[PDB]
Amino acid sequence: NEFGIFNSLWFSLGAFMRQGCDISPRSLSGRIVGGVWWFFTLIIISSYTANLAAFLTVERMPIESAEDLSKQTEIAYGTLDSGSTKEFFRRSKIAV
Amino acid sequence: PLAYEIWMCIVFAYIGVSVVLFLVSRFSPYEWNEFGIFNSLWFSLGAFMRQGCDISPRSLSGRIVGGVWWFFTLIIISSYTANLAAFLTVIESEDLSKQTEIAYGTLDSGSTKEFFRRSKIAVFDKMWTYMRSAEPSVFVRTTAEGVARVRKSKGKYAYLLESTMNYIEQRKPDTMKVGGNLDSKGYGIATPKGSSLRTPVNLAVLKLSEQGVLDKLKN
Amino acid sequence: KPCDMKVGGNLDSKGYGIATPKGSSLRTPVNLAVLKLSEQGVLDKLKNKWWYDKGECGTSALSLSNVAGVFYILVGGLGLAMLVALIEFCYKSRAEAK
Amino acid sequence: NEFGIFNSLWFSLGAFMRQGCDISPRSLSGRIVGGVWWFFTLIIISSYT
Amino acid sequence: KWWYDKGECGTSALSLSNVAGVFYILVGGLGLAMLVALIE
Amino acid sequence: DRGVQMLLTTVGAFAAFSLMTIAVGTDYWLYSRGVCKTEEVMTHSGLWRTCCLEGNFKGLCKQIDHFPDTAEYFLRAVRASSIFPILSVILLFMGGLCIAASEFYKTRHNIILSAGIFFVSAGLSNIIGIIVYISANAGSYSYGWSFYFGALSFIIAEMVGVLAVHMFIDRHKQLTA
Amino acid sequence: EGYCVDLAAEIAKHCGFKYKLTIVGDGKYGARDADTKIWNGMVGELVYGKADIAIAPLTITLVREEVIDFSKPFMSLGISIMIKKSKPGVFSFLD
Ligand SMILES: CCCCCCCC/C=C/CCCCCCCC(=O)OC[C@H](O)CO
Ligand SMILES: CCCCCCCC/C=C/CCCCCCCC(=O)OC[C@H](O)CO
Ligand SMILES: CCCCCCCC/C=C\CCCCCCCC(=O)OC[C@H](O)CO
Ligand SMILES: CCCCCCCCCCCCCCCC(=O)O
């Protein structure tokens, strides 16, 4: 019924899982520690759920195009040395 | 938000946690812990719904069981809410041939109707076998008639027409082109066999092609 | 194999054709044969035969795979709890004065 | 105390605001009512957020 | 010669940097609690 | 009401053991749509043999090829050798054996506790086996009556464990009098 | 063996001729050298009369159609990009 080391650990774990308490501090110092741990828990668990929602929402909605190839130079690119592909590029009037 | 298997295994884990909490809480004669099997089940249910506790295990082992059940509950309920937030925030082809709820047809006289009447491809021959015998007729006298039939049939009529016309997708109000093209071909300027205009018009089409006129006009 | 991808749309649209010397006698029969093979579906069968028949590379809810780890932890914790309880019970049962 | 009409209204309101308990039903019937109310609260509050 | 011969330039997870403040508040609260207990 | 409790626990142990053994031996765990012995047709796949039906040569079937990142290797190994379903079968067998021996060498009232522990452990092994099975399947479908025989064996095993622990508690309560 | 080997046999049957497959000596499709103005590849073989027909993935292009004849397309295509290229982790709930 009082905060020994094992009961202190149980209170902290239960406060983190938002799983209620069978006992809470009664003194000013115990209540300062409890309140600050409750704040830390609220921010951390809200942030876990918010970031998991962000992960799933973004997942629900490195070259993707010729424009991509044209704008970069880390990735080399070419064609058959003799072919209609090489001629397509040698004569294209399209900017990209 | 959660797959059927997650719900089923949540129920199995609930039964297992309740039984192991009951066993560990009251099995040794030296403990004789108000966790009977009924109270173990109540504690586990109220822990899962993130609701009041009213009793918490006091032993080391009952506390291990309680702690892992609390962690499991936090992860599973957080993920249910996150995936529901994801859900709230944000005929494909052969498909026509394999079904009958959605009717489908072509222009009553066209290269499309002839494509199907002569196809030796199984899916298209199956579609032709259906379309030529469908009643009421799935064929339309004009493209506009086919478009209106799609628009007024509440999704129960799909229309087969050339990709180019399927233009209608960019017109007010409700239609969409789905899947790839069933074939590949081209439109040509036609003249009577042996016409004097054949050569100049063939060369002009190539000149208009090369100078970009045909792309400007389609755009 | 090793199946290690086509990206983006096609840059243009064109076709492969059977070619003959300018003015060849074979030009008309071969043009008509290509159209016969096209109309009878031979060209589709042959592309499928050589591209896909012998190809060596061929939901929204949350699946049990996404959370299986939490189930493994839960059952491991239940096992550890049972072991701790039995260890303490054996200790107490052996600690009675004899 | 036990669940009179005033205490039962308080129990239900506290359950909906996810604000834990001072008492909880002890009998099988009370616990069935409490269980379905807890499930209802969880789905409705998760869906609101 | 004038451009390149003389060239002089040759949904992630959440990091401890955007929750650090709450850790600082937590440890400050633990220090304040210890001080209040010792004063009493 | 002691006496009928012993019959109920013995019947439950035998039922759980039989159900879990049938589930492991039988192969209607998953109604997938794949290839029978080496056309895509339905199949009553199981823990060992992916077996065919509604096909050109239905009824002829083979041994599933489990194998084609150590985590995937470990999971594929644990799901290839059904160690967890088989361990569930063994633990249910030993639990039943303890319950049976609870009539001979009576007055120990400490082996019936071992029976309860064996039944609870069998349930836990069974649930791990279901999780690894479903996880490895993710490498349309449905689940067959073999899957539900395994699940029902889990439920009956947990109930029989609760009864065994209750009987052990009652026995020490009588002894303490 | 191949798509064009299968197609060659069928074109030959439907046109009624016997044929001999030959691999283009320079292994090229066909381009007019800007400089020597000589056509190489399969197009050159047809232009200079070394071959009577080309049955290959030979693209119908304006510059080629000016010097050789092409049937209607037996295959439709376009230039594309080829690039060198998931199971969730068990403890992915910590991500
Ligand atoms: C007195 C209190 C009694 C004790 C109460 C116990 C309950 C708390 C357990 C929490 C889960 C612990 C396990 C966390 C999972 C660890 C897995 C991990 O670290 O994964 C590694 C990963 O692969 C990258 O390295
Ligand atoms: C110890 C006292 C016990 C207290 C008991 C409290 C009950 C708590 C749970 C209630 C929800 C259970 C009902 C869930 C119904 C699921 C609906 C369903 O079955 O899904 C339909 C179908 O599968 C898809 O189309
Ligand atoms: C009855 C006894 C209870 C005892 C009390 C328990 C503690 C209360 C809980 C949390 C305190 C949180 C403190 C928040 C600190 C805010 C820091 C801040 O605001 O700094 C940001 C800055 O203003 C931007 O520029
Ligand atoms: C803590 C234990 C009980 C918690 C409530 C869990 C609800 C169980 C539902 C099980 C069946 C779910 C069926 C969904 C799949 C489907 O719609 O096809």
Q: What is the 3-state secondary structure (H, E, C) of E13-30?
A: CCCCCCCHHHHHHHHHHH
Question: Are residues A24 and A34 in contact, defined by beta-carbon separation less than 8 angstroms?
Answer: yes
For chain E, the maximum distance between any two Cα atoms, rounded to a whole number of angstroms, is 78
C21 dihedral zone (left: phi>0; alpha: psi -120 to 50; beta) = beta
Q: Which residues of chain C lie closer than 8 angstroms to A68, CB-CB?
A: 8
How far, in Å, CA of F134 to CA of F85, rounded?
13
Mutate to test the interface with B, among C34, C40, C70, C73 (most CBs of B within 10 A): C70
**Cβ pairs A/B, distance under 8 A:** 55
Say which DSSP state G89 is in.
P
Report which bound ligand comes closest to the CA of C69: 1
Which residue has the CA at smallest separation from atom 25 of ligand 1? G91
H or E segment and range at residue C7: strand C6-7
Burial class (CB in 10 A: 0-12, 13-18, 19+), F19: buried
Q: Which residues of chain C lie closer than 8 angstroms to B60, CB-CB?
A: 84, 88
Torsion angles phi and psi, residue G59, rounded to 5: -75, 135
Comparing alpha-carbon positions, the chain B residue that sits nearest to A10 is B63
The full DSSP string for B68-104 is: HHHHHHHHHHHHHHHHHHHHHH-----TTTT-SSSEE
Positive/negative CA dihedral, B128, B132, B137, B143 = positive
Domain residue ranges of chain F, discontinuous segments joined by +: 4-176
How far, in Å, CA of G8 to CA of G55, rounded?
6
Positive/negative CA dihedral, C79, C81, C84, C88 = negative
CA-nearest of B117, B157, B167, B162 to B137 is B157
Positive/negative CA dihedral, D42, B14, A21, A15 = negative
Residues 6+ apart with CB under 8 A from C7: A63, A64, A65, G80, G81, G82, G83
Q: For ligand 1, what atom is nearest to the CA of residue B63?
A: 3
* Three-class SS of chain A: CCCCHHHHHHHHHHHHCCCCCCCCCCCHHHHHHHHHHHHHHHHHHHHHHHHHHHHHHHHHCCCCCHHHHHCCCCCCCCCCCCCHHHHHHHHCCCCC
CA-nearest of F120, B10, B45, F106 to C85 is F120
Is A20–B89 a contact, with Cβ atoms under 8 angstroms apart?
no
Q: Which residues of chain A lie closer than 8 angstroms to B2, CB-CB?
A: none
Partner residues linked to C16 by β-bridges:
G59, G75
Method used for this model? cryo-EM
A10-49 as b/e, with b when 16 or more CB fall inside 10 Å? bbeebbbbbbbeeeebeeebbebbbebbeebbebeeeebb
Alpha-carbon torsion, ordered C29, C34, C39, C40, to 10 deg: 90
Breaks in chain A after residues (C–N exceeding 2.5 Å)? 61
Give the architecture (CATH level 2) of F4-176. Answer: Up-down Bundle (1.20)
Partner residues linked to C15 by β-bridges:
G76
How far, in Å, CA of B24 to CA of B41, rounded?
14
CA-nearest of F51, F53, F58 to F29 is F51
H or E segment and range at residue B157: strand B157-159
Mutate to test the interface with B, among G65, G74, G93 (most CBs of B within 10 A): G93
Torsion angles phi and psi, residue G54, rounded to 5: -120, 125
Report which bound ligand comes closest to the CA of D34: 2
Q: Which of A6, A10, A48 sits opposite B78 (nearest CB)?
A: A48
Quote the ligand 4 centre to C85 CA distance (angstroms).
32
With a 6 Å cutoff on the Cβ, whether B4 touches ligand 4 is: yes
Q: Which residues of chain C lie closer than 8 angstroms to F135, CB-CB?
A: 64-65, 68
* B 36-95 residues with CB < 8 A to F: 37
Q: How far is B83 from chain F (nearest CA, A)?
A: 20
Please name the amino acid found at residue E17: S
Half-sphere exposure of F113 (CA within 13 A, CB side): 20
Is G76–B75 a contact, with Cβ atoms under 8 angstroms apart?
no
Burial class (CB in 10 A: 0-12, 13-18, 19+), F116: buried
Quote the ligand 3 centre to E29 CA distance (angstroms).
9
With a 6 Å cutoff on the Cβ, whether B37 touches ligand 2 is: no
Please name the amino acid found at residue B169: E
Please name the amino acid found at residue F81: S
Please name the amino acid found at residue A87: E
Entry resolution in angstroms?
A: 3.5
Q: How far is C41 from chain B (nearest CA, A)?
A: 6
With a 6 Å cutoff on the Cβ, whether D32 touches ligand 2 is: yes
Say which DSSP state C95 is in.
-
Report residue A19 as tokens: 């799983």
* F 57-76 residues with CB < 8 A to B: none
Q: What does R_g of chain A's alpha carbons equal in angstroms?
A: 31
For chain F, the maximum distance between any two Cα atoms, rounded to a whole number of angstroms, is 72
The full DSSP string for D31-49 is: HHHHHHHHHHHHHHHHHH-
How far, in Å, CA of B65 to CA of F134, rounded?
25
**Chain G contact present for A48, CB below 8 A:** no
How far, in Å, CA of G53 to CA of G58, rounded?
11
Report residue F49 as tokens: 């043999």
How far, in Å, CA of B4 to CA of B11, rounded?
11
Helix axes F145-176, F4-25, angle to 10 degrees: 150
How far, in Å, CA of C66 to CA of C63, rounded?
6
How far, in Å, CA of C39 to CA of B115, rounded?
8
**Chain G contact present for B75, CB below 8 A:** yes
How far, in Å, CA of F46 to CA of F24, rounded?
8
Burial class (CB in 10 A: 0-12, 13-18, 19+), B190: exposed
How far, in Å, CA of B110 to CA of B106, rounded?
8
Burial class (CB in 10 A: 0-12, 13-18, 19+), F78: middle
End-to-end CA distance of chain D: 33
Question: Are residues B35 and D27 in contact, defined by beta-carbon separation less than 8 angstroms?
Answer: no
Q: Which of B12, B23, B29 sits opposite F127 (nearest CB)?
A: B12
How far, in Å, CA of C35 to CA of C17, rounded?
11
CB atoms within 10 A of CB E4: 7
Q: Do chains D and C touch (3 or more CB pairs under 8 A)?
A: no
CA-nearest of C62, G90, C68 to A53 is C62
> Cα–Cα distances in Å, from G5 out to B121, F153, F155, G9?
22, 61, 64, 6
Q: β-strands B103-105, F41-45: how paired?
A: unpaired
How far, in Å, CA of F116 to CA of F165, rounded?
5
Per the document, the length of chain G is: 95
Question: Are residues G30 and C16 in contact, defined by beta-carbon separation less than 8 angstroms?
Answer: no
